[PDB]
From a paper:
We noted that TCR4 has a significantly longer (19 AAs) CDR3β loop than TCRs 1–3 (range, 14–16 AAs) and a panel of more than 17,000 HLA-A*03:01-restricted and HLA-A*11:01-restricted TCRs. We next crystallized and determined the X-ray structures of each TCR/pMut/HLA-A*03:01 ternary complex at resolutions of 3.1 Å and 2.1 Å, respectively. Both TCRs dock using a conventional, diagonal orientation. Overall, TCR4 engages pMut with n = 30 intermolecular interactions, including n = 6 hydrogen bonds. TCR3, by contrast, engages pMut with far fewer contacts (n = 17) and only one hydrogen bond. Together, these data illustrate how the unique structural properties of TCR4, including its long CDR3β loop, permit the receptor to form an extended interface spanning nearly the entire length of pMut. The CDR3α loop is positioned parallel to the core of the peptide backbone, extending from the P3 His to the P6 Trp. The unusually long CDR3β loop, on the other hand, reaches to the C-terminus of the peptide, forming hydrogen bonds with the side chain of the P8 Thr and the C-terminal carboxylate. By contrast, TCR3 engages only the central core of pMut. It is noteworthy that both TCRs induce a major repositioning of the P6 Trp side chain upon binding. In this conformation, the residue becomes buried along the α2 helix of HLA-A*03:01 where it cannot be contacted by either receptor. We conclude that TCR4 binds the pMut/HLA-I complex in a unique manner that maximizes CDR3 interactions across the length of pMut, thus contributing to its relatively high-affinity and low cross-reactivity profile.
Numbering used by the authors:
A (entry chain D): 8 to 128, 133 to 198
B (entry chain C): 1 to 9
C (entry chain A): 1 to 274
D (entry chain B): 1 to 99
E (entry chain E): 3 to 249
Write the structure that this text describes.
Amino acid sequence: NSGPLSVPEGAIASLNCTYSDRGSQSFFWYRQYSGKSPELIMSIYSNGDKEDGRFTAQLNKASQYVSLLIRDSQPSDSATYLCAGNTGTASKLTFGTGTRLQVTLNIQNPDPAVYQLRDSKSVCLFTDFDSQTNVSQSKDSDVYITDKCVLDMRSMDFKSNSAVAWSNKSDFACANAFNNSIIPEDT
Amino acid sequence: ALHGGWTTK
Amino acid sequence: GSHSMRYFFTSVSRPGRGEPRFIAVGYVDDTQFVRFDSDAASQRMEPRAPWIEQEGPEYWDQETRNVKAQSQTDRVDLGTLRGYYNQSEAGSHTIQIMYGCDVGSDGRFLRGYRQDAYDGKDYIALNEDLRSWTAADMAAQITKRKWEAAHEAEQLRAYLDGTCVEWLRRYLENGKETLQRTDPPKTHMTHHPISDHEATLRCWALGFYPAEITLTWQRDGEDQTQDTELVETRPAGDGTFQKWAAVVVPSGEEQRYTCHVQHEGLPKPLTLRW
Amino acid sequence: IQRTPKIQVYSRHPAENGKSNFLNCYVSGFHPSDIEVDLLKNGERIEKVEHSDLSFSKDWSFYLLYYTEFTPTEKDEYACRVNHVTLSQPKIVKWDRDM
Amino acid sequence: SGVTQTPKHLITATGQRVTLRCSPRSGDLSVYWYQQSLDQGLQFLIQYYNGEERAKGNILERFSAQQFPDLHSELNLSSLELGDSALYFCASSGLAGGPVSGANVLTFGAGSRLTVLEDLNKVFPPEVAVFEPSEAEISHTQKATLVCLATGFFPDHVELSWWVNGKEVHSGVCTDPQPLKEQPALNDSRYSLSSRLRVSATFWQNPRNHFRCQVQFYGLSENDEWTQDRAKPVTQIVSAEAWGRAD
């Protein structure tokens, strides 16, 4: 199973894995952040359920079903989760198709607006928008719009979203930069 | 069949 | 009746004569069906029973890989234990490992076991509860803590109630013609006069399967274990077993002794009289 | 630490003179595993002798079985020569049909 | 971690041979080599155990591997193809004899990203520029968000960071997950990346604060041949600085 899931913060995420080889005996849940290396988070040996901290692994070998249950999902859980199986201590691990988990953040006080930054050249910053706001990628071809971003000022526990578009032409104004956008609140 | 691996003593 | 599958491994350090010798043998209840010799030319898991040769190449590759893995681990453990006991490097030492699982008549899992020994003495065994380990000496406490930290009991238990029992059911279903048979023992009696006063009255039972058989002697109702010399049940080679039990009797009262044979292939315990 | 092999020389079937059979030498209860086992016909070695693969009983004592095909006769006597670390000199056990 | 892979980034052409070295964790005997492409997941390549071969999976004949008696391993790839560009991981499990402590788990290494190109003449370092917060944001939300834009680089190897007064900062920082292909139609197009750092309004109004955006670009290892007259696109760092305004 390939994601993403888009489970909001504080909810219960549930992943499952498709494993091909029917000969494995012990199963493992690894977590891998983008670019980093897979780190083990769960080990399960007996058929049935097992729980550790916020995580709960589940296994049914007869049907090759492996599942993970993340309780009280946090933004620090957004990663690819992989399942692996082996037949012994130093046997070979075979990984299945992992699943991407993305935990969305809930903003209390949104204040959507679009600004313009000038330095040695022009970009339009669109920040402080709601969590439920789809950001389209490109109205034109000579324009570049990136996806969302989450700034967490930890000195205030203040979490906000942002996105940036830029170009080099006279046909680029911050009022028409986000042609495929939604929120009715501006500068 | 046999087992897959075992830990050294 | 119940059935069992077991694996036996022997590693012998022969210093100066190359790497340690490693021999692995697989039994289904009394019948050797796989074997591996570290000095054999094939270096592969080889069949020894007619009902195992029908497995695909994937099976043989997997069994070869697992056997060689066991051999590597045991070759490491040889040096580990030689250093544990501060033993000389020129001495030849032996590690022996046995593990397996039992099933019932309907095929349900009954029990499992693993036992490891060093130089013929018990080193470390799996308890009956399949969750703890029993260690003999202080050197084995190291291995006990090491295997407890590695959750090895849980992985072995997951191997026993799973892969082991399923493959044993497969073996029993494939070789059902020769593995679920009960050959009754054919019995007879010989009389050898040792001197003019006493004579050896020997009771023979041949061609029985399995090897579990009871040979008893009675002098008019009571078992006299003062002269009954039993003998290790020996394999005939074709798949059956043989066993004899003799007794020294004063010449003239051979008619007062009786040989009783108890085996699962006999409806009633037979009685033999010279 | 060391244990002496128990030797048993016998035949697969009741040895009927003039009919093919097998000659078994079954050693058990020995330790260590290194052991030489030869089958002697009238005193000389037999080279077409196949043995089983090494296993051990519950007391960690090894057991091997050596066998060879033959045809028993009246004048031919057979024996088994076992040499082990626990034996100062090789032990010879003769075959006995009338046993 | 305990597991060490070398190199971390490698850029070579087709038909070449590369070698990946891996020293396992102190106390482990077995060494596993896995391959992770974007299409599939982690594919098992090979596993050695104490010098001998322990397991082999779906691995091409062009791939050789070895484990030396010092427990460190090498993986050699020959006749490289474009499809061979993936992320190769080295893990270590198995516990050496004795009272050696450690978890009975696979400990993965930092990985080594290999990118195979048809020609290295399309490798370009990034250009980094910092855009200062607008007057509107300082007065509207009492905050200040600096943006950093690193454009015109290939391949994808890049790491972006923010340094305030010489200290790498992470609070109030957000970097883009994936770079944006400038021309999504070209197979060998360049990429761009954006990052954002948000502080209070009065903090940016301090004219003595120095904010630097640093982009570590991984490229040629100063051993590859370079014929064109422009500078070697080698592993380097491009930075863009900015001071605080008072107006």
